[PDB]
Symmetry: C4
Subunit: 321 residues, 4 copies
Amino acid sequence: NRFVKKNGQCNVEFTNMDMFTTCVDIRWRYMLLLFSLAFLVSWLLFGLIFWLIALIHGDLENPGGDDTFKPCVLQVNGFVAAFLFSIETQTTIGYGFRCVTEECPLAVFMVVVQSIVGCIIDSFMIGAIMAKMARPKKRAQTLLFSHNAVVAMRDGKLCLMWRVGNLRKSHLVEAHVRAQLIKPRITEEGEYIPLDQIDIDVGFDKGLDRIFLVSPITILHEINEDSPLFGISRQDLETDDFEIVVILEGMVEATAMTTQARSSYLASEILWGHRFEPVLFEEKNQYKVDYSHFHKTYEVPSTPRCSAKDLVENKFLLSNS
Amino acid sequence: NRFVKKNGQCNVEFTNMDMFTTCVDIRWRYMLLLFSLAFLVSWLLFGLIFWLIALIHGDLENPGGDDTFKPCVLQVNGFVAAFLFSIETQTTIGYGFRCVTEECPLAVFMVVVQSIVGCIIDSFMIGAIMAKMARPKKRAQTLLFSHNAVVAMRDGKLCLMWRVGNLRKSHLVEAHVRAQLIKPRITEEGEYIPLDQIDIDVGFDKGLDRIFLVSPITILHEINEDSPLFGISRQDLETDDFEIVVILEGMVEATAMTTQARSSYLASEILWGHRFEPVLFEEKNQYKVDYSHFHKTYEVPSTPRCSAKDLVENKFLLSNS
Amino acid sequence: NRFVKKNGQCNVEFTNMDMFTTCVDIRWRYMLLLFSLAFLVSWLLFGLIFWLIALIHGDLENPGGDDTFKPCVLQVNGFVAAFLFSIETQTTIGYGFRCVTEECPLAVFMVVVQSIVGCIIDSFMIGAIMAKMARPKKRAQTLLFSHNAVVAMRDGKLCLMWRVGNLRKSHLVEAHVRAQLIKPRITEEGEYIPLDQIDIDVGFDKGLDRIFLVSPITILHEINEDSPLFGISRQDLETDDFEIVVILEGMVEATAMTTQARSSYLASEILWGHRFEPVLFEEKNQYKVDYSHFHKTYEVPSTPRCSAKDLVENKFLLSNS
Amino acid sequence: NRFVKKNGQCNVEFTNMDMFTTCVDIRWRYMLLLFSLAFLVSWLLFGLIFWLIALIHGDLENPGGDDTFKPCVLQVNGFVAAFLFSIETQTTIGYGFRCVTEECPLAVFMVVVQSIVGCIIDSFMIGAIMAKMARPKKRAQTLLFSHNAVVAMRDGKLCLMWRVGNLRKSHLVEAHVRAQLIKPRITEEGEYIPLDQIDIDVGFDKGLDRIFLVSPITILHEINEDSPLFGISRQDLETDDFEIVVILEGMVEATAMTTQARSSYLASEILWGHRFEPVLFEEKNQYKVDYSHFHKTYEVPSTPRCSAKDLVENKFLLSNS
Ligand SMILES: [K+]
Ligand SMILES: [K+]
Ligand SMILES: [K+]
Ligand SMILES: [K+]
Ligand SMILES: [K+]
């Protein structure tokens, strides 16, 4: 039946899976203690001002006032009371026992000031809990490479292969693969490149490196005249110092945040003359993917042990003679 | 007249269209009951603390106080009153009947604590109603494929074709098409690929797969020597087990979120020797698109019933002899 | 001197320039009247509830209460008072004259409910003023095409050219150009394509269509054997029904929102045998761009009046004989 | 050992490194004084209204009221008191001394109005402190070009080279390089291009311009028949007026904001017959990058002083004879 329903939906089911710009990430909870401190500082500061004012105006000795005398702020009898009024103003709780009066302009202006300050402050609190909210780090890896890469024969050509798959049913828009052989080398003129990155060809020029990934795919590198692996046999493989890097880029269907997935195979991690265990099965009305067979491989004794280079050379001696 | 006005505007009119990172999507309204619970828990907790304090300080028996005795918080006569003061503090309603006094530091500190807690809490409430606000799922599909794909003759070549169109007047920046024949196969060496994805060529190498989509377009795949459809005739079509996938990627003009539109044609869903009904008409000063003709097709009896492979083979026998 | 400073900075100066997902864009100010309505509805509803409660409990006739009788909410003497208490609760103004008491659980629960409701409501208000805040429409066009396109001779080849430029000093990351001849045509087999889009080659295959745009650039299309313009002379130009579309895509340096800039030239809008007036001048220590010369052009009488096709044909008759 | 751990992690360590849409960026702190003004204006306006009402209703002479007379708003004895009530309403502090009463509908409606206004206002305040919060300018440059570019011999070919490196351990998804020779020139037909941008080939056609950048890389431009540098020797280099631009695009792993890094080399800034000092060293279990050697270079006297053009020409005279 259908691999892709007419609406784009996929027919597969997955089984058996195991300046201050730095302030956005500024801290885990240290920002919370930071803001709690921000408040405390502002509350204590304005309380001291209100207490200074009540002290000077002489309210401390007549906090409630009377017919002849009106406090700047009612009911401030000390610094503790002062502290309270400041809080109630900024928090805008405003119980009202401590209350401003029309007497002192300085006091009124001070409330006016404290109100704006207070607003700005928690306004920023929402911004910091915005930044730190969505600006992640450590996004779960949705993509997977076979633990090993395989060298075997497919359709007459000798090929290095490895597997990639999505752990999520979510699609990868504009996905493409790359590979490089990495190793030190010395140029013809005797120049030293400590680690050289040599492209390994997955089909870029025809755009076959463009992939549609639903179920796990085996990526093919034909080893040929233009391959850095052209002169390598199965024995060389248990010798050589080279390492292969593999990449899969693309964009998460939901985010449109381009992703780059990486992994590596040492010469020692490449299994010659093997093949991957099929991960995809058809059961009646729909397709299943058994993810336990992902890394699993099996020997193909009929696989030639020599290098692709000698493989091709031999062909012509069986031609010429 | 003009297809594209000098300012970029398009001249067409459309007619007849029918960790906790998972918390962003955490729920529909279960988050609302979650937060309502968050509040309730904090309100009840602080009320119990205030009630514990009023109990110990002995306020329950003299809630209003007198000349010789001052409560930590005025007017707490029970747990219900206690509950109320907690609410009024956090909500910052602060009716003021239940009111803090300068007596108990513990109480003052508790208010101080409850104020910061309360702020943080709803600060987060705005973040959750941020995440859940714009982080969508199920974005309406703006793109469309003809229900069927057609095989006919164009400009001398035999071609598999299918239609794509935008349901919205909104443009697709950097849009491109891809296609693959999907089917099981067994390699020369006898290896089984359960479902193989073979590229179908829409013109990638010349970059003709890059498209400017205003009105609906017919996508052409020339069936030639290098096509997987090269050896297929009209009769094979009512036999074969293959399925074709089609893709259109690009980015919504507004969002710049790369989109990937999918659809499929079974061999059985491919109509041989047909053509699409034109969707675009010119009326005087501007262009119309009649979207009722989108999926509509018609027979072209002059269309050859054989495979493109034999089509080409025959040419040379009418050459040689 | 330098076009690009060693830090990447550019040395040019510019002169003489003239479900409810739809709710994000839901309205201009109709959303503001919407929310104002949202509040009003909630305020009136809860006030009616509080008034219902005060009515039943018999508070209307003893609003202040006394030694033997305690109202659910103090000082509710009517619906107007009721309305007020509801407001003061939700707004959390809480003057305190109308005040809740520990008597009626129903009332307490109602306050509890109204508090959460109120919070959720304006929480959403911040989300709507978030969506409608940054989710724009009508982004100012930063990119510009010469009003006309020119056909002239450059470096021995006959070429259709047109100009593009940035109105902003801001760079375009990964910018590239495309062009298409648009016109109706009838296929060899007699099929009608109402408007056909034919690629015009700006150098894609070598990736010369990739451009670095600081000062305005002239885009070149070599008219050759593979060009749809190959058979066109200056006289044909004052006849033909074809139109040319031009595109420039890329991403705004700041936004990384891919942009697609469009414009068109009718055959009648193409000026044959002309050239563009240079927009870029060097003055001593830095480069200026005079944007008044952008669309300006001048005749080049030495320009051949014939089609590039006959231009090439003639070459060989002056070869053969 | 490993360059890339099996999970994608990199094995290198770095050492020795030194309408109103314009309102988003509208100002540094001028927006803060703007909003503070926004509040003040609204507070003063509503206070004047409340004062107008209290004046007309005759409350000024009986602010507290009595058995026979009820003020619209209690305790407004002047404009200063009026100012206060307005503040306490909007801020929702609501001390309660100045308090609304059920008498004047006009007043009630006014409170109702002031409440919604107040909410909208600071709602917007959160949006402006949203825009101005994350919409940056001046993002730190994470990418680096060698101060100079080198011409030397590698693997038999004469090549212009320059270095690029990431200052951050953060990866660049889909990174690619470009280069252009920039200089004035006059066309065959005698047309003047003030500054011409000529592509310099870094391997685009094979997609070798696609790079995987962990440690700093040397970018190679083979100087050959198709190079604008083909006819240039070491002596020409101390003469010529040309400048070379270099670009590196790609997307920051975290942001997915495409970045374009630029830099330039004047003919005078190109060091002929040199090579770069290796920046990468292997110490036991892991790789180090010494960033002090980045710009450092050394002479290679064996480097030919002539132009690649004559280099190749000479080859055939040592062939022919
Ligand atoms: K209050
Ligand atoms: K309040
Ligand atoms: K109050
Ligand atoms: K190519
Ligand atoms: K409040």
